[PDB]
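Example 5.3 — Actin-binding Rho-activating protein
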Amino acid sequence: GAMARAEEHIYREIMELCFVIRTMARHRRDGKIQVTFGELFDRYVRISDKVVGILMRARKHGLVHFEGEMLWQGKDDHVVITLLE
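Solution (predicted structure tokens):
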């Protein structure tokens, strides 16, 4: 029992993406969450298959520290997306 990071308690809207990020990265248990593009995509592919497209929404509030205007599967997979909340 502690205050934790409550990264998810930072923004309700983010719940849309955070919900998926919490599945890939178990860091949610400790607090902040982080996942690579490759992993995220490979996880969203079984849902909507457009994580990169959703990231644009979260970026509106500076939640994605990712770089570039987009990420190409197999190319920008190295892109590490760290939930900024």
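Remark. The domain at 1-85 is CATH 1.10.10.1540 (Arc Repressor Mutant, subunit A).
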